[PDB]
Every structure is written in C-alpha cells, then in structure tokens.
Structure 1
Amino acid sequence: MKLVRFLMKLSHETVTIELKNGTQVHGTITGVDVSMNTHLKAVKMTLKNREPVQLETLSIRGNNIRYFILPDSLPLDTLL
C-alpha cells in the first residue's frame, strides 16, 4: 500500500515537517493531498542557522519535504 494515504488521513495534529534545505516547520497540519502537499496553520519555521519565525499559514510541497515527525499519541495501525 502507498504511504500517501496514511499521511492524507491526518487533521489537527501538531507535527513537524523537516524540509530539504535545512528548514523545519512545526505546526498543526490542516490539509494533506496525494502529492504530499502539507498545508498547516499557525506554524513555527526555523531555517538553517536562523531565528524561528512564526507564520499564520504555510503550504509546503511534497518534493521539498525531507522528513516528518508525528506525536507519540498517534497509532500507526489504524492509519495504515
């Protein structure tokens, strides 16, 4: 099975998406598509050796995201 369907079934979860170019955005993921497009609201983004800025809304692409970090209160058996 594809792993995009497990990531698409995530709403109102405070996750942390680490991008490829040293960027890490931690926030509540509000929308996910089949192309791994992560639309989050009220997130905090920290770049490579930069100050963590805060944004009201962010839309990270699928090819620009490198890794994801989910909370510990998230079962993986029901999402797969």
Structure 2
Amino acid sequence: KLVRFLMKLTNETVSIELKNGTIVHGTITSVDMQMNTHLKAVKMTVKGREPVPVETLSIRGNNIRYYILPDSLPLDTLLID
C-alpha cells in the first residue's frame, strides 16, 4: 500500500487541486489511510470565483485529483516502509 506515504508526511504546506477543479493551498494537519485529508490555514480558490481563506478544512478522499509537494522532503527515505 502506498497511501501510507501520505501519513508518513505531515505538517507541511501543500497545494491541492481538487476534483471539481478548485485549488487549495495550505499545510496538512493529518491525512488518512482512507484518503481523508485535513488542512489548516489554507487558501480556498473556487473555480471561477474570488479566492477566500479559511482556518481549517478537510477533503473527502474521492475529491483529491493530485498533490503539489514541496522540495524539502527526503523523498527516498520517506518511501521506505
């Protein structure tokens, strides 16, 4: 299983494009093996709408399209079990 790579990483800023096309940008509080991701101090940008910030927010797993990870992560070591 590779979702474990998601919870091995925690508490860092990440940009997310959701399933509806909207883009969110913030640091994760915790992500779930079932792909429920929790976000805090984020940047909510609805498609065709003016961006709005919110303090905390959570995504359902089906709505994640992809991630934008930072470049300060030990990717090689983080991939080991």
Quote the offset at 1:25 in angstroms: 0.9
Q: Which amino acid aligns with 2:74?
A: P
Quote the offset at 1:51 in angstroms: 1.0
Contact 1:30 1:39 in 2 (8 A): yes
The runs of at least 4 consecutive aligned structure 1 residues that moved more than 4 Å come to none
RMSD of aligned Cα (Å):
0.9
In the superposition, the TM-score normalised over structure 2's length comes to: 0.91
The share of aligned pairs that are identical, in percent, is 85
Where structure 1 has 5 or more consecutive residues not aligned to the other structure, the ranges are: none
Matching of residue 63 in structure 1 with residue 68 in structure 2: no
Where structure 2 has 5 or more consecutive residues not aligned to the other structure, the ranges are: none
In the superposition, the TM-score normalised over structure 1's length comes to: 0.92
Which has the larger helix fraction? 2
Q: SS of the counterpart of 1:77?
A: helix
Q: How does 1:8-47 map to 2 (within 5 A)?
A: 8-47=7-46
